């Protein structure tokens, strides 16, 4: 029965995913504070995009409520009512549990559950909906029967949940903090190898946008000489943090490996279909190379030849270790195409190695794909 | 075609209504800070109930989105995404438009649209859903087609809406402020006569909970000698404001008029049915008298004899003028039954007039109902 629940989990997370790229474009274009775009336009874009990121816990609460109730809007209302009661209950009870002043909890974020408290608030709303959406009350309460009971009981259950989270949360929030320091500073080779492999595994579903947020915007901290504080690999690299640039492995497979795989898919098509397939693969190899958008190459083989995608996910994972071990760094602000590679080159290290390790990634992806497509008779484009 | 839209308006507001009474019980029992109930329990109840009131704009945005999209949860998500972008856009643009520092706007609430910005954010989400929920994109954007486009375009439209509200809002927020001062201090006789009549008109639908919030919790301001600031007739009366107690008209029709109407409904039933009807009406007359809950008497005649309900709504309106003109004051914390009348009597004025004007309300409601039920042959309980 677990597969029918993994469908509901995926469905619940695709609502949050649907607003991440527009928020990232608004916050990116706005916070860049360009000279050619006016001051008020930049601030409105930054505060609009930053609003969608600040609402992420509530967006997750709604996605989980809708994904487990067959998209009923009263569950989304019940999740919004539950989340606000639960966050407020933790602010009252966490000071008592921790033995620290409420201003220390609030200023150090010691009781901040983030998206996890959103997921729990959605799980309350979904459970209360499926058990009570058909409840019959006595006639003196008949105006509040059925679906109208669900927000009320979700709010009452959010009190008890916020009390329990005030006891359970401190060892969880501590473990989340030690993971961030481990991934940024103690073993970035292992951490970013796991990030690249799991990101590839989530791309077929579009779920990688959620996985990218912590590594891009939350892992590690930097303060510059002006006292500005920066979190996550992307802001810390543009801020000039010498220990940023852990995401640089993306240039190897997005500029060299996947473009080379596209030519290996083209060269292995049947002759009658080889000319027609070539234009799809060129178009797709130039999109990956220039802009770092990879799905028109990935989706061309991913479903009909899953073994090529497992090899690609391994080689895309191993790309992040290689850059960290060789000491080759460069930034991204959108994705690892030639545009980000040239634009963000000012803070870079050993930039001349990306061509040299890249021709290795091109030889490896090309020769894997040509050999396996013939040998296994994989039904890639044109066969 | 307007009636099919008034159904959608009512349906959209009954979602917000469904969470008002639990929030009022939590905030009331919590903020009372009783000695018999422990300190942490009081604070958790107060902050839980206060959270549902603070979320009212967002709860209205969801109710309007769901009420105009046939309850689709992606419209509730789009309303949550729109509301947060629109509030943030006004915080950036209102300083520029007004020519005042952003800290003056934020501290004086000059750009705070309240529930009206919630309703607009829901109207964006509903419009964008009904125009775009079936949109077909080119294949490179196919993962974001259909319903997944609706939150994105609602967020983009929330930017332009927040810019327009930054120009349109200042003369609206000013008019809302002058209405509050008019209703509290300049013509409370006319204002609370309109409040009682319109409240009765909304009771058949349960919509009176929304109408009661501004008069009970937002009209007028009081500062006591300890410097605590209180808003709305209920908090200001318990705080000891000499100009509070405008809601005291409820004791006349809830303790005397409606109990008397219940005996007039009983006495006019056919003899075979008169004994059976008596117990419903006694039960219902004691519920109104003790606790100020009035629907078991109102709903007994309201649909089958609407003329009696129009007369009742007029007499319930006229009850608030009578108390303000005679200078008879008393508080409510739940509703105008004997419990609130005895409990809140300490801050009262001319308390001995409620029995004297009440026996007038009893004679008027009894004699209207007995005469009209016979004369018009109204099919009230037992006929
Ligand atoms: C697909 C299965 C696996 C996926 C899940 C694994 C990863 C866990 C999800 C990550 C949680 C996202 O968490 C959310 O991120 C954004 C962006 O950082 C934060 O946003 C915060 O920083 C951004 C700037 O970066 C501000 O614009 C925003 O105002 C702020 O509050 C949210 O406050 C946080 O709640
Ligand atoms: C459409 C252009 C808009 C202007 C962009 C320039 C503004 C600067 C800030 C933009 C931030 C974009 O944010 C970034 O987007 C890229 C591409 O979508 C995402 O990257 C991911 O998306 C695409 C498909 O969705 C994949 O092929 C790609 O391999 C994967 O890495 C990231 O998860 C995010 O880091
Ligand atoms: C049925 C048709 C006619 C009905 C509509 C006519 C009346 C207009 C609707 C009133 C709007 C309610 O507005 C909403 O009220 C509550 C309670 O005051 C406010 O709540 C505010 O005060 C309460 C205490 O009273 C706090 O607990 C809360 O933290 C706070 O932010 C909301 O911040 C405000 O947004
Ligand atoms: C169930 C008892 C719970 C304990 C109550 C004591 C705690 C003190 C704070 C309670 C606040 C209740 O809030 C108050 O509720 C009453 C009764 O619901 C409402 O009053 C309205 O509701 C009922 C029906 O719904 C009507 O018959 C009544 O005529 C009408 O005035 C008010 O709009 C609100 O002012």
Author numbering:
A (entry chain A), B (entry chain B): 4 to 386
Paper text:
The phosphotransferase system glucose-specific transporter IICBGlc serves as a central nutrient uptake system in bacteria. It transports glucose across the plasma membrane via the IICGlc domain and phosphorylates the substrate within the cell to produce the glycolytic intermediate, glucose-6-phosphate, through the IIBGlc domain. Furthermore, IICGlc consists of a transport (TD) and a scaffold domain, with the latter being involved in dimer formation. Transport is mediated by an elevator-type mechanism within the IICGlc domain, where the substrate binds to the mobile TD.
Here, we determined the cryo-EM structure of IICBGlc solubilized and purified in n-dodecyl-β-D-maltopyranoside (DDM). The high-resolution cryo-EM map reveals the detergent micelle-embedded dimeric transporter, consisting of two identical IICGlc protomers that form a homodimeric complex. The absence of pronounced cryo-EM density in both the 2D projections and the 3D reconstructions suggests a linker-mediated flexibility of the IIBGlc domain, which may have hindered the determination of the complete structure of the IICBGlc protein. In contrast, the TD of the current structure is positioned within the membrane plane, representing an intermediate state between IF and OF. Interestingly, the other DDM molecule was found trapped in the IICGlc substrate-binding site located in the TD. Its maltose head group, which is a glucose disaccharide, is specifically bound via the foremost glucopyranosyl moiety, i.e., the glucose unit more distant relative to the alkyl tail. Specifically, E298 interacts with OH-4 and OH-6 (OH-6 is additionally coordinated by H211), T297 with OH-3 and OH-4, R203 with OH-3 and both K257 and E202 engage with hydrogen bonds with OH-2, while the OR is in contact with H212. In a broader context, the loop between TM7 and α3 is shifted by several angstroms in the DDM bound state, and especially the prominent phenyl group of F337 appears considerably displaced. Indeed, while the maltose head group competitively occupies the substrate-binding site, the bulky alkyl tail of DDM partially wraps around the phenyl group of F337, interacts hydrophobically with residues from the SD and displaces the entire TM7-α3 loop, thereby preventing the full occlusion of the thin gate. Therefore, DDM figuratively acts as a wedge, supported by the thin gate F337. These findings suggest that the elevator-type sliding motion across the SD/TD interface is impaired, resulting in a blockage of the transport cycle and gives rise to this DDM-induced intermediate stalled state.
